[PDB]
Amino acid sequence: VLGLYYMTRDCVNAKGEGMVLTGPKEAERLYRSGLASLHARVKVRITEYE
Amino acid sequence: EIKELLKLGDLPTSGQIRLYDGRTGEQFERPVTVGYMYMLKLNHLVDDKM
Amino acid sequence: KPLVGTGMERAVAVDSGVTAVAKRGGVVQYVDASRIVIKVNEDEMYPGEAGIDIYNLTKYTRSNQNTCINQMPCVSLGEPVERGDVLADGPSTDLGELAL
Amino acid sequence: VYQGETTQTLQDYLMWQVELTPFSDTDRAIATSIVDAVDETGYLTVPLEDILESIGDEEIDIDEVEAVLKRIQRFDPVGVAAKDLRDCLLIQLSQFDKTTPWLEEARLIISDHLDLLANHDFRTLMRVTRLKEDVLKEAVNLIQSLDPRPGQSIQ
Amino acid sequence: EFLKPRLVDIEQVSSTHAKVTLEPLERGFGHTLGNALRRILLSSMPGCAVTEVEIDGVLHEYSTKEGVQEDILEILLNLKGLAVRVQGKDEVILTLNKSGIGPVTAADITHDGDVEIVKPQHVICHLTDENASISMRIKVQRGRGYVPASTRERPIGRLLVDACYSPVERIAYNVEAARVEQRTDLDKLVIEMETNGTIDPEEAIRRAATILAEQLEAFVDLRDEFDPILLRPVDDLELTVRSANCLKAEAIHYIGDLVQRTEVELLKTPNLGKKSLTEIKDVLASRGLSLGMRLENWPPAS
Amino acid sequence: SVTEFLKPRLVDIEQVSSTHAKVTLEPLERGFGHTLGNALRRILLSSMPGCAVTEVEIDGVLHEYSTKEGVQEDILEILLNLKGLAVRVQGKDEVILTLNKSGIGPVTAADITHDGDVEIVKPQHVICHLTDENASISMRIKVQRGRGYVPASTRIPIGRLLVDACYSPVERIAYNVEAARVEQRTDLDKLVIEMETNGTIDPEEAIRRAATILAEQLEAFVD
Amino acid sequence: ITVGPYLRLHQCGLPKKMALELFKPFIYGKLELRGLATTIKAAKKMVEREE
Structure with missing residues (x-):
């Protein structure tokens, strides 16, 4: 619970804030490379099924 | 008094330092409380339980 | 030793009776892993006696809980001692302090 | 209150080995009778004719009893349910590897001339078996290394 | 580039x-x-580490030696921290002899051509009696990792030491x-x-x-055992002429084939009576075998 | 050993x-x-x-938040669609391509003008959609060679829109x-x-x- | 009991020394089934020696 709560939070001014990503995999690449913060507020293209 | 004793030994006053993961070398995101505790071994041995 | 204590370690270590405590002052005449011989001071000797104290240490003895009881000396050959000093440490004792 | 526990005797161990052996119904009955006939030292106490009578069926010959007895004699310990000392020693020697230095001489002594060894002759025995004293000592030592009472392992 | x-x-x-x-x-x-x-x-x-120690008069590590300040366990702990460089071989034996009152250190080890002691001031024990002497033999070998002595008979008196190479x-x-x-x-x-x-x-x-x-x-x-007795031929058994002929008429060549046959199957074959079946059972029982044994994955390539 | x-x-x-x-x-x-x-x-x-698209220019677009009437998506959507374009340039470390189309339907990578060195991996990749028959699209796409990932924020004429490069x-x-x-x-x-x-x-x-x-x-x- | 973080929901971690004792007759049957042992005492001795 603590880990999931920590990863799904937002900070006001984090590294990589305000960029546009092609998908979740690009977000993971940015996080692992150290180019973006885990709490940065961005816009992501999401595909969802109903 | 504890903070003064920490200052005498040239240690951070908060009692928290930066650590690195041994498997990847990456720094943990937040400072961690590291110090010394007195541990005991109790007379409940798994050799006598199994 | 705990390295963070309260000040009661010495009292518990000495009053328990697991250590060797000097009955009279003197000089360490003989030291060994199993026995200690103390040459008593001349002002603490009784008339007509050879003033020496002999301490035989408990070595690797079974306890009531199938554990080990073993004493080790903490004095060197030729050093002065006084009455009440600790001569040998018992189990869970470090220079006269409780060490659990 | 402690009521006591159960112990395993020689006959219990032999019956445990019988139950896990691929016997038929008649073979299992014969094995039951044979194991009943075994005493605490591991020797058979009745002739095979008594066992054949105790089976109670006229369709069974003595050769089947002999086969069942031979199979049982290879149970653990080896040599159990032997008719006499000679049979027990021969059974024990049969399980040894062929590389043993003095298997053949010991087998010859046990099979042919066992009374001379019991009487401590050591002179007529040499003449009968045509051996010297160099090999006879080793053969007797090998014979004395066997177990005369195999049933005491579960005493 | x-x-x-x-x-x-x-x-x-x-x-x-x-x-x-x-x-x-x-x-x-x-x-x-x-x-x-x-x-x-x-x-x-x-690296190299101490693995075995033999002291002259001691029998086990839970004892003491007259005239020595430390117990045997503490001496072994001190020897566990000895630094040795060996330039010629993967095993060596060092000898230590000392007498008289004083600290027994690593500089008292008998000199060897292919062995170097990098910290001669390493204290091993103390002799507190004038007529007290100690003589020991220490085994050093090369390896890597950490091998506890439990995870590796010996005469009474040889003491094992955990190795941190x-x-x-x-x-x-x-x-x-x-x-x-x-x-x-x-x-x-x-x-x-x-x-x-x-x-x-x-x-x-x-x-x-x-x-x-x-x-x-x-x-x-980057790219992408049966028991020996079962393998002996059927002629190893000393069967009669008719029993051997009947078995060979059923293409039963090895013991592992005969053992898998049950009594009924061997009784319904022609020219084989109850007496021959009993003889076969007797000769099988002489070796400690029976009929009706199931084997998986037979034969093992003949 | x-x-x-x-x-x-x-x-x-x-x-x-x-x-x-x-x-x-x-x-x-x-x-x-x-x-x-x-x-x-x-x-x-x-x-x-690797090789990746670095920046783009569109005739009717001067700012990232501009208008391209006749195009179903916004400009940043087109930038995202261009960022996922795979190339196999076998020559110089810098090539420029031109894209021109008119009609109604999906404008894809197969509509890019042919070039000898450049080899499109997925022609089915969709760049945008045109709704009106009179609508026209014209743009120039520059591809360069590099290592790893370089964000456009660290690189801060007229109408030059920067694109994150995924080499x-x-x-x-x-x-x-x-x-x-x-x-x-x-x-x-x-x-x-x-x-x-x-x-x-x-x-x-x-x-x-x-x-x-x-x-x-x-x-x-x-x- | 300790914690196994790598396990799947349907799995547990059993010590093999316990498992050898718990499943002994199954091991006897499997040893006799593939010819490794020819008698019950042979399988018993093999399990005792822990080959």
Whole structure:
């Protein structure tokens, strides 16, 4: 619970804030490379099924 | 008094330092409380339980 | 030793009776892993006696809980001692302090 | 209150080995009778004719009893349910590897001339078996290394 | 075309402390090399350690020796921290003899041509009696890792010691900026190494790099009993003529084939009576076998 | 003896798709799975040669938040669609292409003007959609060569819209270490690597290239 | 009991020394089934020696 709560939070001014990503995999690449913060507020293209 | 004793030994006053993961070398995101505790071994041995 | 204590370690270590405590002052005449011989001071000797104290240490003895009881000396050959000093440490004792 | 526990005797161990052996119904009955006939030292106490009578069926010959007895004699310990000392020693020697230095001489002594060894002759025995004293000592030592009472392992 | 790193400088701060500089490195390769080198250095370096000790009069480690200040266990603990460099062989035996009052240290070991003691001041024990002497034999061998004595008969008196073969105590690394001729985007790696003084830092770095390259070569080229008695022929059994003929008429050649046959199957075959079946059962029981045994995956290629 | 280590014996490759692979290697010495996996993942993510779109220009667009009436999507949507375009430039480290179209329907990568060096990997990749018959689209796309990922924020004429450059062909790389044993030793590593590329190269080729780069970095010390 | 973080929901971690004792007759049957042992005492001795 603590880990999931920590990863799904937002900070006001984090590294990589305000960029546009092609998908979740690009977000993971940015996080692992150290180019973006885990709490940065961005816009992501999401595909969802109903 | 504890903070003064920490200052005498040239240690951070908060009692928290930066650590690195041994498997990847990456720094943990937040400072961690590291110090010394007195541990005991109790007379409940798994050799006598199994 | 705990390295963070309260000040009661010495009292518990000495009053328990697991250590060797000097009955009279003197000089360490003989030291060994199993026995200690103390040459008593001349002002603490009784008339007509050879003033020496002999301490035989408990070595690797079974306890009531199938554990080990073993004493080790903490004095060197030729050093002065006084009455009440600790001569040998018992189990869970470090220079006269409780060490659990 | 402690009521006591159960112990395993020689006959219990032999019956445990019988139950896990691929016997038929008649073979299992014969094995039951044979194991009943075994005493605490591991020797058979009745002739095979008594066992054949105790089976109670006229369709069974003595050769089947002999086969069942031979199979049982290879149970653990080896040599159990032997008719006499000679049979027990021969059974024990049969399980040894062929590389043993003095298997053949010991087998010859046990099979042919066992009374001379019991009487401590050591002179007529040499003449009968045509051996010297160099090999006879080793053969007797090998014979004395066997177990005369195999049933005491579960005493 | 990346720029390759080279070993620039080695600073020997002490006899057990050193700094090794690698330069130049591209962007991000400093940490990639540093963490792998730290793990390999802490994990896989080889060294020598004490494994067995034989003292003259002692029988086990839970005893004492007259005239010696320490117990046998403490002496073994002290010997566990002895640093030895052996340059000729993977096993050696050292001899220690001492007498008289005083500290018995590592400089009292009998001299050997191919053995070097890097810390002669290492205290082993103390003799407190004038007419007291100690003589011991110590076995040293080469290895890597940590091998407890339990995980490895012996005469009464030979005492085993846990082996910690690793010569490296701690490893640290830093990445700074390298001021190369005409570029300002190259890094420099500094490895700080603390050991027991029995290994050269440069050979340690080279050995770690060699291990890493050998392990990595697998990715550069990346692409995708029965018991003997059952195998003896049926002629080993001393059957009669008719029994052997009947068995050979059923193509039963080996014991593993006969044993799998049940009594009914061997009774319904022609020209085989109850007496011959009993004889076969008797000769099988003479070796401790029966009929009706199930075997999986038979035959084993004949 | 003391310089001899275990080597992988069971190597298994599973092809989920043409650009998605799983590789299993075992047995390994204790702790080597993390070493090898982390080194390979770092190299694959950070330092890997490739070619990518760097910036674009559109005739009717002067700012990122501008209007291109007749186009279904906004400009940033077109930038996202261009960022996922795979190329195989086999010549100079800098090429420029022109895209012109008119009509009603999807404008895809197959509509890009032909060039000798450039080889489009997925012509089905959609750039945008045109709704009106009188609508027209005209743009110039520059492709360069580099290593890894370079954000556009660190690079801050008229109408030049910057695009994040993804030179590395790796889209996703992950690894996991599991327990494996030999009949005598039980504390051994088993390495599983799951990776997906964008189609420019196979996952196996990417793994081999990363291993080659790392091995060649060590030539100055390997005995 | 300790914690196994790598386990799947349907799995548990059992010590093999316990498992050898718990599953002894199954091991006897399997040893006799593939010809490794020819008698019950042979399988018993093999399990005792822990080959």
